[PDB]
């Protein structure tokens, strides 16, 4: 872990580390576990420097929380875009008076969550329309500031 | 549709053709004045170096233009870069010097 | 003629001391200054170390940028080179030595 | 620091959200969070944007085991020993 006394947490992150010194309910357990499943389990093939872009590890945690963050991951990943797409977008919006270019190097761990479904935007804008609620005050600016 | 794709890992940078071919900064190109004007900075930055000491030659299409002369003594070294450097650098989407 | 013209000279030397100048590959670099000073300081008696301008190897994709050189060897001489990016998995751009 | 914005790695401040640059003139324009204290020549991003990306370097667990009634019992083994060194026993 980060910070000082990283080795302080090992004892809690990996049960199997403590041997089986005495005869205790705790040890009876540790004795029951398998040695080989602890620490780093599998890692990414791609890497920057001598560090891997991602890794799979065994360690204390709870299936629920893990499972949640699992879906949260997915959801974001699905929202990915790549600069090339941005080039097309901004350029097309301009109606052809300028042309945008977004240079970039090759990478797969470049997260840019911005893509969504029209459905979502509609739902969202219905909320906006309801917000007005006949209060000129809310519109007054939009119209003016645009003019 | 001309655009430029930077070089990487030693490779050369390349600008896009008019037919969609991408060439390196060398050879004989043809630029309509306007095209440069609308990108003075970016171009001067990317090409000047190759024009001066490299192997790139550009033909800017102008049609008509005002000119100014600078005479020199033939027996002594004379390099016109400083003169043309200024020209290129002072080109704008609104002006050009003699 | 050597600098901006098309004259290239091979100086026969036999053996000679050399000196290295490493530079960042992704930035302009013109070795004329060094190779000038070398020529300038040759003498019926002296001859300073030959200066070479070499690129810094890299363990990752990098942009490229022009580099003007004037002095190269005529046979392998980088034998003193022990290892590039020694602490990394592999060299992506530039001289790769294991 | 800058080139990092293109993917090229360290061979700009994270404060940057938008880095624009024109080709016909020398006048770049960058956007920063309106919540910053140094709008020095920087443009702003007013939108009330949600923080999606967040990181946790800790443990991915939400349950913790606690002691309700303490206790201390005698044991045959008191610690691990190596040459002259001796490490204590830490249970999970």
């Amino acid at each position: 872990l980060p910070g000082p006394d990283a080795e302080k947490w090992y004892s809690i992150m990996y049960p199997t580390r403590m041997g089986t010194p005495n005869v205790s309910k705790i040890c009876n357990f540790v004795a029951s576990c398998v040695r080989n499943r602890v620490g780093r389990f599998d890692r990414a093939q791609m890497m920057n420097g001598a560090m891997s872009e991602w890794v799979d590890v065994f360690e204390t945690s709870d299936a629920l929380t893990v499972s949640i963050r699992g879906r949260w991951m997915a959801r974001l990943a699905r929202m990915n875009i790549n600069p090339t797409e941005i080039e097309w977008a901004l350029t097309e919006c301009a109606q052809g008076y300028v042309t945008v270019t977004s240079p970039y190097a090759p990478s797969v761990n470049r997260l840019m969550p911005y893509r969504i479904s029209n459905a979502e935007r509609q739902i969202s804008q219905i909320i906006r329309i309801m917000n007005i609620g006949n209060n000129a005050t809310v519109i007054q600016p939009v119209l003016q500031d645009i003019s | 549709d001309c655009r430029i794709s930077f070089g990487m890992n030693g490779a050369a940078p390349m600008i896009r053709d008019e037919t969609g071919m991408m060439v390196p900064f060398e050879g004989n190109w043809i630029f309509p004045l306007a095209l440069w004007q609308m990108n003075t900075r970016y171009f001067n930055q990317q090409f000047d170096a190759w024009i001066k000491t490299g192997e790139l030659r550009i033909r800017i299409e102008m049609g008509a233009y005002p000119y100014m002369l600078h005479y020199y003594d033939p027996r002594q070294y004379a390099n016109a870069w400083n003169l043309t450097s200024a020209w290129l650098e002072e080109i704008t989407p609104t002006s050009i010097p003699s | 003629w050597i600098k901006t013209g098309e004259l290239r000279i091979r100086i026969e030397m036999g053996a000679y001391p050399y000196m290295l100048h490493y530079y960042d590959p992704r930035q302009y670099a013109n070795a004329w200054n060094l190779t000038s000073a070398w020529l300038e300081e040759i003498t019926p008696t002296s001859i300073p170390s030959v200066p070479f301008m070499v690129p810094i190897s890299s363990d990752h994709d990098i942009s490229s940028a022009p580099a003007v050189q004037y002095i190269i060897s005529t046979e392998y001489n980088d034998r003193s080179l022990f290892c590039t990016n020694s602490s990394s998995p592999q060299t992506i751009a530039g001289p790769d030595k294991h | 620091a800058h080139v990092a914005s293109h993917g090229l790695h360290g061979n700009e401040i994270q404060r940057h959200i938008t880095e624009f640059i024109s080709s016909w003139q020398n006048h770049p324009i960058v956007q920063v969070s309106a919540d910053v204290e140094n709008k020095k020549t920087a443009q702003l991003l007013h939108a009330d944007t949600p923080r999606l990306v967040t990181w946790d370097a800790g443990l991915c667990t939400s349950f913790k085991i606690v002691p309700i009634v303490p206790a201390q019992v005698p044991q045959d083994v008191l610690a691990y020993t190596f040459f002259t060194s001796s490490y204590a026993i830490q249970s999970p």
């Binding site: - | 000047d48 | 530079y23 302009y28 670099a29 070795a31 060094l34 | 370097a57």
Partner: peptide
């Protein structure tokens, strides 16, 4: 570790390049 403060309240060799001259 880094830290991003909340905006809300919670539960609590010549190098002089040939084209860089400003005009």
């Amino acid at each position: 570790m880094k830290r991003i403060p909340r905006k809300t309240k919670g539960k609590s060799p010549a190098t002089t390049e040939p084209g860089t001259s400003n005009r």
